[PDB]
Amino acid sequence: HWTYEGPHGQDHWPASYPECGNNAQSPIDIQTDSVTFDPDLPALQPHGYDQPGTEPLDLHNNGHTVQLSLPSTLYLGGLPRKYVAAQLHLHWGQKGSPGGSEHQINSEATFAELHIVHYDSDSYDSLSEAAERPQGLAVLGILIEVGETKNIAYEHILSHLHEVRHKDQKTSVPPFNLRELLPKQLGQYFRYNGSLTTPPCYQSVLWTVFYRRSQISMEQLEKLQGTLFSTEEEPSKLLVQNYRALQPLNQRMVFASFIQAGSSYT
Numbered sequence: 001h002w003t004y005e006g007p008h009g010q011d012h013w014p015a016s017y018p019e020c021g022n023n024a025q026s027p028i029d030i031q032t033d034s035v036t037f038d039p040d041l042p043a044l045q046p047h048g049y050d051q052p053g054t055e056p057l058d059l060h061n062n063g064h065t066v067q068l069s070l071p072s073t074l075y076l077g078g079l080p081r082k083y084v085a086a087q088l089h090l091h092w093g094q095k096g097s098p099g100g101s102e103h104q105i106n107s108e109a110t111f112a113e114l115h116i117v118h119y120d121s122d123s124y125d126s127l128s129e130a131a132e133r134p135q136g137l138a139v140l141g142i143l144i145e146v147g148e149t150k151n152i153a154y155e156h157i158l159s160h161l162h163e164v165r166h167k168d169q170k171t172s173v174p175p176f177n178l179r180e181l182l183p184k185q186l187g188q189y190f191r192y193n194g195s196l197t198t199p200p201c202y203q204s205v206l207w208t209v210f211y212r213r214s215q216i217s218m219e220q221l222e223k224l225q226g227t228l229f230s231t232e233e234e235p236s237k238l239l240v241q242n243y244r245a246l247q248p249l250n251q252r253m254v255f256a257s258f259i260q261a262g263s264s265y266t
């Protein structure tokens with residue numbers, strides 16, 4: 001039903017999904033000269049990331065992104081509640097165009113963004129249930145840029161895109177070290193209250209966006225940008241530009257878990 005572009009595109013989401021028009025939405029542009037340092041923000045502590053179970057993980061092209069199911073044995077230990085892993089997925093732009101990430105830092109987008117989705121199992125029994133509640137979800141956002149060499153960790157995912165080119169196709173991915181999908185310096189991140197960046201746009205996410213970026217090769221990017229289709233069959237249409245436009249900060253506070261010399265905040 002909903003899409004990024006067209007009649008049912010993002011500019012029209014509010015006409016079908018009211019919350020998409022609300023005022024504490026995601027993604028946002030994080031301007032470091034406006035964040036507030038919070039010395040009490042804990043280390044994230046991803047648990048079980050190195051070994052996401054022993055069974056093959058499902059990889060699904062759902063027409064809007066490619067999504068990897070994750071076992072609830074993985075969870076984050078440094079949050080207000082116990083948030084267990086449910087899935088991760090990606091947002092990107094398109095070959096020959098700039099951008100592709102959802103969040104921006106100091107008004108600069110990167111080529112793609114990885115979202116690892118967790119939900120509060122202390123309070124709820126499923127991802128879908130938690131997705132509609134206040135701080136029901138905790139999503140980790142990793143901005144992805146292009147580096148000089150192939151990133152093996154991301155390759156564990158990218159090497160399977162050709163198996164799920166059509167919307168709704170699925171394939172299997174052997175467990176791999178998920179920690180390697182994360183950038184360096186896990187201790188430097190931003191934290192704010194936001195929402196799902198796709199319809200229904202529920203304001204249920206406690207967001208964590210890392211300060212440092214992960215890097216994939218130029219070739220891995222082109223592969224991410226032009227393999228999957230948004231269609232179930234012919235004619236085929238490439239799944240591209242699946243990132244939502246920036247949403248107004250609307251006076252929310254963005255907190256930083258770190259501070260350094262020359263930080264634009266004190």
Ligand SMILES: *[C@@H]1O[C@H](CO)[C@@H](O[C@@H]2O[C@H](CO)[C@@H](O[C@@H]3O[C@H](CO[C@H]4O[C@H](CO)[C@@H](O)[C@H](O)[C@@H]4O)[C@@H](O)[C@H](O[C@H]4O[C@H](CO)[C@@H](O)[C@H](O)[C@@H]4O)[C@@H]3O)[C@H](O)[C@H]2NC(C)=O)[C@H](O)[C@H]1NC(C)=O
Nearest residue numbers: 038080134135190191192193194205206207252253254255
């Ligand atoms: C995302 O949005 C949520 C919802 O708005 C925010 O949650 C609120 O966070 C504030 C923290 O600033 C909470 O208010 C403070 O509560 C302190 C007591 O905390 C305990 O008790 C509360 C209430 O039962 C619990 O929610 C909490 O978990 C603790 O168990 C008070 O000590 C604070 O008062 C002091 O500071 C104020 C300044 O605002 C002074 O005026 C007071 O005199 C005093 O010095 C304050 O009341 C609030 O309870 C939270 N609401 C909910 C529903 O959780 C998140 O902070 C926000 N996250 C981000 C990253 O933006």
Ligand SMILES: CC(=O)Nc1nnc(S(N)(=O)=O)s1
Nearest residue numbers: 115117131139195196197198
């Ligand atoms: C059930 C569930 O997780 N739905 C989501 N919708 N958008 C998400 S995102 N892009 O904000 O991570 S997660």
Ligand SMILES: [Zn+2]
Nearest residue numbers: 089091115197
């Ligand atoms: Zn996402």
